[PDB]
Scaffold this active site. Structure first.
Site, short mmCIF file in Angstrom:
data_model
loop_
_atom_site.label_atom_id
_atom_site.label_comp_id
_atom_site.label_asym_id
_atom_site.label_seq_id
_atom_site.Cartn_x
_atom_site.Cartn_y
_atom_site.Cartn_z
N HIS E 10 79.17 -7.23 55.74
CA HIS E 10 78.56 -6.74 54.52
C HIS E 10 77.13 -6.25 54.72
CE1 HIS E 10 81.42 -10.08 53.62
NE2 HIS E 10 81.98 -9.11 52.91
N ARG E 93 65.61 -15.60 43.72
CA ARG E 93 66.38 -14.72 42.88
C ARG E 93 65.51 -14.27 41.72
NH1 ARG E 93 69.94 -12.98 39.51
NH2 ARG E 93 69.78 -14.55 37.85
N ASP E 210 68.22 -10.72 26.09
CA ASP E 210 68.98 -10.80 24.85
C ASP E 210 69.01 -12.25 24.39
OD1 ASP E 210 70.55 -8.10 24.41
OD2 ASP E 210 70.64 -8.50 26.57
O1 NOS Z 1 73.88 -13.09 28.76
C1 NOS Z 1 74.05 -12.97 29.97
N1 NOS Z 1 75.15 -13.55 30.61
C2 NOS Z 1 75.42 -13.50 31.93
N2 NOS Z 1 74.71 -12.86 32.80
C3 NOS Z 1 73.63 -12.23 32.27
C4 NOS Z 1 73.27 -12.24 30.93
N3 NOS Z 1 72.14 -11.52 30.73
C5 NOS Z 1 71.82 -11.11 31.91
N4 NOS Z 1 72.67 -11.48 32.91
C6 NOS Z 1 72.48 -11.05 34.31
O2 NOS Z 1 72.83 -9.69 34.41
C7 NOS Z 1 74.17 -9.58 34.95
C8 NOS Z 1 75.14 -9.33 33.83
O3 NOS Z 1 74.76 -8.22 33.04
C9 NOS Z 1 74.41 -10.84 35.77
O4 NOS Z 1 74.32 -10.53 37.16
C10 NOS Z 1 73.29 -11.81 35.37
O5 NOS Z 1 72.45 -12.15 36.45
O1 NOS Z 2 89.46 -12.68 54.59
C1 NOS Z 2 89.04 -12.25 53.52
N1 NOS Z 2 88.58 -13.11 52.52
C2 NOS Z 2 88.12 -12.74 51.31
N2 NOS Z 2 88.00 -11.51 50.91
C3 NOS Z 2 88.39 -10.60 51.83
C4 NOS Z 2 88.89 -10.89 53.09
N3 NOS Z 2 89.19 -9.75 53.76
C5 NOS Z 2 88.90 -8.81 52.92
N4 NOS Z 2 88.40 -9.23 51.73
C6 NOS Z 2 87.98 -8.28 50.67
O2 NOS Z 2 86.76 -7.70 51.06
C7 NOS Z 2 85.67 -8.35 50.38
C8 NOS Z 2 85.03 -9.35 51.32
O3 NOS Z 2 84.64 -8.75 52.54
C9 NOS Z 2 86.24 -8.93 49.10
O4 NOS Z 2 85.84 -8.13 47.99
C10 NOS Z 2 87.77 -8.87 49.27
O5 NOS Z 2 88.39 -8.03 48.32
#
Ligand code: NOS
Ligand code: NOS
Ligand code: NOS
Ligand code: NOS
Ligand code: NOS
Ligand code: NOS
Ligand code: CL
Ligand code: CL
Ligand code: CL
Ligand code: CL
Ligand code: CL
Ligand code: CL
Ligand code: CL
Ligand code: CL
Ligand code: CL
Ligand code: CL
Ligand code: CL
Ligand code: CL
Ligand code: CL
Ligand code: CL
Ligand code: CL
Ligand code: CL
Ligand code: CL
Ligand code: CL
Lengths: 241, 241, 241, 241, 241, 241
Positions: E10, E93, E210
């Protein structure tokens, strides 16, 4: 007279008899030792079930100290009552613990940021999900800063509050060590969510009595010195809270 | 001298200082009352953490009585030690309880056949499955027959041992009543599986202090009379065990 | 005629066709054997799905006997209907079991005080908590006293009702033995909570066909003799209920 | 003679007495009806516990039919044995079901792609996780194509296999309908993972007897016609498998 | 050339291309904005899957910034790799959140001490028990002290990391508010235990976009100003770590 | 202009900009490759968070393609929006996977009938029970028939969608192989229940990149060829849906 007023089933203190800040330890006899050696203006305010509690002052500031017994269900009773009936604002649990962490040692002082558990009580509060029993940051910081001012080193991190002192659970110690849980005790995970419910504050500080892995163990004198260091940190922290 | 031998972290009694049969109640001060009024040849054998314990005889037969504190984790410590270190064979928990059952009343005496729980401690013992905390039949029968000989009516059936005295759980009371749980307490479900582990025996008898649904409540004098009836049943039962 | 009245989807008996006391065994062909050898005034009252049921008298007292099939879901259907539609007051399950306990032997008769399980049906009844499937004490006592009068030794204690006859579960047998579960079967844990729901009574008695650990196994003739002993205990117990 | 060879505790058939393809229905008397009306070269191969099973041919191809009883634990016993001892390759469950789906109707034929459950048996197989009880695609396709050739409409989708026929579970029907579960029965979720374990094939087809929401119910004659349609689909599907 | 070295599936960055301190936000385009406006000496070090990452300096100190995607499984991949392969010591984060707390407001800055979750990933790490996803105290303190020096008010307390943005869960918001969870997001609960596993540090700071209860919502300009305040706190905190 | 209309927090496409049929893959850059090589009449309809999405035609039929990110929470956001806001009828997930099955090989094409998971999201939808994430049969069949017409062999069966790419879970691979799970990925188990909620359709096809047991791994060129085969199957399947 053979009967006194009972504000709760477990506490004969009247509302107002507890200060807004309370130290709690498991052993009520240790609560008495704390009161008799560190508090002024002190009075015994509870003895129901032998769970001694006292109210006085530390350096002039109102402070109570009381036993909580062993385990989450016991501390939950006493702490729920303190926050709800007695209008307490801050509880610091003061106690002892074991450790499995390879870099934590007997006699170390541990300041707890959050506590895991094998109890169901917090799942019951959050629709079956993971609810972290989390210390209040102001309390954690007050303990950390007090230890610094006293030149006492501290470990700061997670505890684990178990329902089972006499563990038979294969793999538990290895997982706790892998994720650097520093303290094993039986109560903090029940205290912190109750403080949250009441919009109040809680924390915990503990001294390591035993290393569960290496088998090292503090002698009685070492445990006394450790407790003296820990209690001084806690007492000084209350002045900031 | 400021230090005594400790057979366990929680009990200063030496092995042999506990009889093979033990009554345990939550309140150590009640353990003292039992010892001071029903035992002969009696001595105090523990006072660590204020958890008073005593050994003597009831009608000539060796018998101990000790407090267990509140909640499954607390009784588990003390009972594990009694069976393992002190070689106890039979523990009868004697206590108080609430009820939700529409046909159970304040002052009733409840003999527990098994106890449900919201604790995880028994799932941990049986691979995550349902492990019924079950009283030993000889103990149940001894309690039932003793009450009959004393002409004291009893309710016989299930208890529920909760970790949370201050329940906020919607629907719990309705389910407990629907399935005719007769007693709500905080300990029996932790005791019975420990007895099983050691190949030993346990049971529980409790008196109803409060009806959780109707709000009926025993006065202090009624609670004293109820406890007298219950303790006599338990004491007579020990002669059969 | 190709169609008869159906009081339930699973039973063609009319209300009133079942006695207030019922013995149930898994094998409907064994229910027939019981009826044909121990009941007078007997009639077949159900044959839906081949799940034979019969009503007659044992020593003049009304008694029914019916198959229940294998597993908690099957007994739950039949027992729910018996208590609800047919107004039955007492069900005694009579059956066979395995054992893992080191001191229980093939051909032993086990009287069940409570039954554990790997099913979810009892968690569903008590808000996800531990609900012990517990036999009624009067039923247990009637079985114990009947065996005594017949000079038949019995083991009295916990069963375990599994959903999976063909276990692949590492560590299960070791845990069951450690806590002295005496009988492994597939049904009792579903029966007892249904009896509770209806304010009614249930129990279980089983004979050990196989030792799961030692591999000992009763021959067909030994199983017949064991069943004869067990059924006589159950039948005599019904006279007390 | 009063004793016959037993290849399993539940089946007197010898290995080789079952065909590689088996239809199973809950009611053994329905298994007999299927054998007596659709098979040639037929013989009864089991009657232990009244769980009738038969082997013959359908349009010349070897085919067995046997009852499975009610519930996951019962079908699990019989199917485990069929795949393991009797070397069966394909089992099609044929049965009846309820529905809650607003667009499924009494008398509809449902071909099951996967089945949910309230049982723990599949969590036990996959380390506590979600293991979908999934029909084999070739079996599903054979059923779908057979129904098409017969001009019989079908619903294709998820079933739900419950341990509790007599549901008391608030909100269950609403959730099942929201996610378009088409069939409520008690067995498929136990069958499909056993087929997986043995590297074998399974599927399920059911006819709707009752609409759980609208209270519509098929008459006895309608149920007969529905079963005739369903069994013809299943029988024709076996020729493709 | 159509192919580059891949240190992980990745991430195309080579070991050494990430600084020991990393800020991560969900949106990779926001990672680019942070790099382009606050870092010097900056280079793009990853673009696999569009998950942009950058390394440079903030006030001369090495610092990386990278997107993490939405949800616990996504951040877990990226953070596991950063700690394990790239030898990162500290991850903060930085993100947005909702709130249900009655005293938290849109545009507030929340510093996370621990995060609850509806994910199973932490139960899997601690034998099925409650493992609190807990921020490192030094990181929390650095964020708190940086905000103080910048005169930016902060809320300090628990977050809740959900797997389900589009909640349909009755009662969840009420429980979160009752226990004073201040931030609802989707990631922190997965990050903190990974940091623990590696003996490393993590924290989280978020701005409220929000209010889930009152429906208040920050405008795009307000969200920009909030993010500017939050990012300055995070950047200044890295100088202390 | 620095601001565009947002139909959802995660997608700037207007309603109507997505076709009724959508292919989704985890990598948005792969979505772009699909659009640029297989669609006509194509336009980019989203780039929020870099999660590229495109709408055009495949052989004249409207078709969209968009990234979904990694993990159940990410796909759940995007798919919920597609079905709810954008009125999509059919989503086919196209992706890569690992395998543990001894008879599945790198480069194989897997058509998913249902997907297991270690996520809690489906328990939350069905009262805590087992809800199988099940592909729609018409989608499965369209994929199977398209592969047949293209002379591309396929494996058809269960996937497992994990929250944890970097598994540390002892015994997981052995259980997955024992029950013949053919594909390990991170998303399908979240997609299928959302399609069910909306009365819509979903499926998944994946190519094996890595054998988790044997360590075999497809080269970049082999992965390209595998993806070409898989995408052609998916595209042809959309013409039947
Ligand atoms: O109300 C909420 N619920 C869940 N995730 C939220 C919320 N507000 C912000 N995020 C953040 O934004 C992404 C989703 O839009 C998520 O990745 C989270 O980190
Ligand atoms: O062995 C595996 N385990 C979990 N996810 C996998 C695997 N191979 C492929 N993916 C796929 O690729 C992403 C992670 O690299 C995940 O989004 C999944 O859909
Ligand atoms: O290793 C330990 N495990 C559990 N609790 C401990 C340990 N060490 C100290 N305590 C503390 O002392 C009591 C038990 O003796 C508990 O109340 C707990 O707070
Ligand atoms: O209603 C009740 N709930 C829980 N425990 C109770 C109740 N009534 C009595 N006890 C008993 O008394 C202590 C708590 O006061 C517990 O130790 C329990 O044994
Ligand atoms: O070892 C055993 N496990 C599970 N059930 C058993 C066992 N022995 C006897 N039964 C009993 O017989 C049927 C299964 O053959 C079940 O109905 C159960 O009651
Ligand atoms: O609504 C229903 N719930 C559960 N099982 C059902 C239902 N309708 C039919 N069956 C089927 O018939 C038996 C129970 O009567 C079960 O074996 C099941 O397969
Ligand atoms: Cl203490
Ligand atoms: Cl006092
Ligand atoms: Cl320990
Ligand atoms: Cl008491
Ligand atoms: Cl003493
Ligand atoms: Cl209460
Ligand atoms: Cl039988
Ligand atoms: Cl009949
Ligand atoms: Cl077995
Ligand atoms: Cl049938
Ligand atoms: Cl036969
Ligand atoms: Cl129903
Ligand atoms: Cl972001
Ligand atoms: Cl790059
Ligand atoms: Cl939301
Ligand atoms: Cl992809
Ligand atoms: Cl765009
Ligand atoms: Cl992996």
């Amino acid at each position: 007279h053979h009967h006194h007023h009972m504000a709760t089933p477990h506490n004969s203190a009247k509302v107002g008899d507890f200060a807004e800040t309370v130290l709690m330890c498991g052993d009520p006899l240790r609560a008495k030792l704390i009161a008799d050696n560190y508090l002024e203006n002190a009075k015994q305010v509870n003895s129901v079930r032998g769970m001694l509690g006292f109210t006085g002052t530390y350096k002039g500031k109102p402070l109570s100290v009381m036993g909580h017994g062993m385990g989450i269900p016991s501390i939950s009773i006493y702490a729920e009552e303190l926050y709800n009936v007695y209008k307490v604002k801050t509880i610091i649990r003061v106690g002892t613990c074991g450790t499995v962490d390879p870099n934590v040692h007997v006699r170390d002082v541990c300041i707890v940021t959050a506590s895991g558990t094998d109890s169901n009580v917090n799942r019951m509060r959050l629709l079956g999900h993971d609810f972290p029993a989390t210390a209040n940051f102001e309390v954690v910081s007050a303990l950390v800063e007090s230890a610094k001012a006293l030149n006492i080193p501290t470990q700061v991190g997670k505890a684990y509050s178990t329902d089972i002192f006499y563990s038979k659970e294969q793999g538990l110690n290895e997982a706790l060590a892998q994720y650097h849980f520093i303290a094993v005790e039986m109560e903090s995970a029940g205290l912190f969510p109750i403080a949250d419910y009441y919009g109040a504050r809680a924390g915990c500080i503990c001294t390591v009595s035993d290393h569960i892995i290496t088998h090292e163990s503090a002698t009685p004198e070492e445990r006394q010195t450790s407790f003296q260091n820990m209690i001084k940190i806690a007492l000084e922290a209350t002045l900031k809270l």
